[PDB]
């Protein structure tokens, strides 16, 4: 009987591939060939943040574009001032091997987690003035890979259990469970409207999820290896994913297929982080070669290189306003570029 | 803007306090030596953790040896896909790899060998030393002395293998037990020497689940690793 299900799945996949091919009347590169190239932008480190002990693994810019949160595996979650480089808070983490961090839009709460399988919440604006654990989300059965705040009460978290979950910070329970991924989820990305989120699960495929409906709305299979990074396009209609194959691929929720690929022969190392600028014309992706290459979202060319780090690049994020970009690396130093 | 300057001074004072706290944290950290404990599911690593300690995805085991803080971390309750989260332990002082030598037939010894090879070849682990604890030696002795579990049936190269000259057999141990032990050791020595060396070293130690000298062995391995890391300083 399993052969019938296998043949049915094969025919469904073939029909979906034929449909995607029929919708591919043209290619984004052939149409953008007329777009003016960005050329070259010599970005320099305007601010250097020091104080982290162990290798930094995660980072997330704040909506205010002033404060930033970075998580290191030394058991500390430091908040830095983008303009003055002054550390605002020094939150010691109960779990040393922290692998994710999230800064709430309002800045009243902060989340983080890792191998402990617990996404602890921290309140930065307590009446006492100190930062204390607000909620512990210990329902996951795997290491927390990435987390992003939907609001002051809702937060999406990725775990090594190959399933994402929507959490209610007030009650501390899984509001909705997202199943369907084959491998361990690595990164998360919230749409501008906070209604959809995508993620890779070490299966060379990205899935579109609905926060309210709680189902895999769409699925992409453009990559060829494990996906470690994902970020939505500023418009919310497309997203780019970073994989160990050393290639970045742009996917559109409406096209349901890969639009273009960003890669180079000399670039053979894996990808760790990917992010878009305010306009989305620049695709800043971190690579394991100790430098971050800026790829033109339209021309598929390297518009710049950020070789200021001495160790592997782990996280990368651009401010909502797009003023400056900070690149995290295992060297325990955060460099802000502009 | 006098208020702006006052807020800047307050933030500078807070940053100085946080810098003092981070200096204290670094003094406490560099004095601490983190260790990763890994091994097959059928290995006796649980007994080792129990002896050393006498829901969460990771357990912390804190033990002191000669006034030296050691933080052994168990990564139990985690899926067997280790290719991703194993990278987080690149900076650990050593990776305590516990393998059951008597677990050879499926053939769990082959799986342990492949896991050790992958750990030794992992790019992000080429600078991390692995402490190979060949656990469950009494079971291997009982199986090879009075038993029909011929190693040549699952390791044809064993038929031509012979005890090396540097072998230090235990007083009273049967020659066959020592031969099997040293063959299983060379099985990992080949992988650890032909795949690369210089950046990290393997410390094979014949131990048992109830052996209390595992703590002293880990202490000596950490001493050797820190000495070999300090030796790198003297290279301009």
């Amino acid at each position, epitope marked *: 009987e399993l052969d019938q299900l296998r043949q049915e799945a094969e025919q469904l996949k073939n029909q979906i591939r034929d449909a995607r091919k029929a919708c591919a009347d043209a290619t984004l590169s052939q149409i953008t060939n007329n777009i003016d190239p960005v050329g070259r932008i010599q970005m320099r480190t305007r601010r250097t943040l020091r104080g982290h002990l162990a290798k930094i693994y995660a980072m997330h810019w704040g909506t205010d574009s002033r404060l930033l949160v970075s998580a290191s595996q030394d058991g500390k979650l430091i908040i830095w001032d983008s303009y003055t480089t002054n550390k605002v808070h020094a939150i010691p983490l109960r779990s040393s091997w922290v692998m994710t961090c999230a800064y709430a839009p309002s800045g009243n709460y902060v989340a983080c987690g890792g191998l402990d399988n617990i996404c602890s919440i921290y309140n930065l604006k307590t009446r006492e003035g100190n930062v204390r654990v607000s909620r512990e989300l210990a329902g996951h059965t795997g290491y927390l890979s990435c987390c992003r705040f939907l609001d002051d009460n809702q937060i999406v978290t990725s775990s090594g259990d190959t399933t994402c979950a929507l959490w209610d910070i007030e009650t501390g329970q899984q509001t909705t469970t997202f199943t369907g991924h084959t491998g361990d989820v690595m990164s998360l990305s919230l749409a501008p409207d906070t209604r959809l989120f995508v993620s890779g699960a070490c299966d060379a495929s990205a899935k579109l999820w609905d926060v309210r409906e709680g189902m895999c709305r769409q699925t992409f299979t453009g990559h060829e*290896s494990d996906i470690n990074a994902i970020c939505f396009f500023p418009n919310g209609n497309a997203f780019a994913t970073g994989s160990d194959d050393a290639t970045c691929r742009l996917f559109d929720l409406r096209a349901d297929q890969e639009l273009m690929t960003y890669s180079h022969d000399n670039i053979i190392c894996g990808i760790t982080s990917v992010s878009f600028s305010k306009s989305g014309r620049l695709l800043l992706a971190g690579y394991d070669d100790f430098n971050c290459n800026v790829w033109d979202a339209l021309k598929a060319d390297r518009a710049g290189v950020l070789a200021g780090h001495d160790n592997r690049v782990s996280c990368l994020g651009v401010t909502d306003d797009g003023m400056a970009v900070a690149t995290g690396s295992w060297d325990s130093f955060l460099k802000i570029w502009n | 803007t006098e208020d702006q300057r006052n807020e800047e001074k307050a933030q500078r004072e807070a940053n100085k306090k946080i810098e003092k706290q981070l200096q204290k944290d670094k003094q406490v950290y560099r004095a601490t030596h983190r260790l990763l404990l890994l091994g097959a599911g059928e290995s006796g690593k649980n007994t080792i953790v129990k002896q050393m300690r006498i829901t969460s995805g990771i357990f912390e085991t804190k033990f002191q040896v000669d006034k030296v803080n050691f933080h052994m971390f168990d990564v139990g309750a985690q899926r067997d*896909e280790r290719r991703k989260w194993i990278q987080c332990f690149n900076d650990v002082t050593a990776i305590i790899f516990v393998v059951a030598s008597s677990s050879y037939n499926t053939n769990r010894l082959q799986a342990a060998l492949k896991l050790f090879d992958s750990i030794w*070849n992992n790019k992000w682990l080429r600078d991390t030393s692995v402490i190979l604890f060949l656990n469950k030696q009494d079971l291997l002795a009982e199986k090879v002395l009075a038993g029909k579990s011929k190693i040549e049936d*699952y*390791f*044809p190269e064993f038929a031509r293998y012979t005890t090396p000259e540097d072998a230090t057999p235990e007083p009273g141990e049967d020659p066959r037990v020592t031969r099997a032990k040293y063959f299983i050791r060379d099985e990992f020595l080949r992988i650890s020497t032909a795949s690369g060396d210089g950046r990290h070293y393997c410390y094979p130690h014949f131990t048992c689940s109830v052996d209390t000298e595992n703590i002293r062995r880990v202490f000596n391995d950490c001493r050797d690793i820190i000495q070999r890391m300090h030796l790198r300083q003297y290279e301009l």
Partner: nanobody, 128 residues
């Protein structure tokens, strides 16, 4: 999408010979290491053999050395495993496992849980 289609398996008597074939697709067959794994009836996954990218380094398990021959041809993205002499205990579903990442030699495809880069496997049985 990564796709692996194993073939060439079937029934055989003790001492026969089979030649399994796996059709690779959806990736650069030459940039990834190929590994053969089997799951005996009522047992877990067992590593059989592997072949490097260029095909120079080859290794087999002790119960397979000098009995099976692995081979690959990147010119068509296909893997092979020549079985010279089988035995009853060889009955198992042979799955084709690919390296997790390219340009690497550290494999973690022996995972018991569902591996995202393995084929459906081919059923091979030996009986007198």
């Amino acid at each position: 999408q990564v796709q692996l289609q194993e073939s060439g398996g079937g029934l055989v008597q003790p001492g026969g010979s089979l030649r399994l074939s796996c059709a690779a697709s959806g990736f650069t067959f030459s940039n990834y290491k190929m590994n053969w794994v089997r799951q005996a009836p009522g047992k877990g996954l067992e590593w059989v053999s592997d072949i490097s990218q260029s095909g120079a380094s080859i290794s087999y398990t002790g119960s397979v050395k000098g009995r099976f021959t692995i081979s690959r041809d990147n010119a068509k993205n296909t893997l092979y495993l020549q079985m010279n002499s089988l035995k009853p205990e060889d009955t198992a579903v042979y799955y084709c496992a690919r390296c997790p990442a390219p340009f690497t030699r550290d494999c973690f495809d022996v995972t018991s849980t569902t591996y995202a880069y393995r084929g459906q496997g081919t059923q091979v049985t030996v009986s007198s």
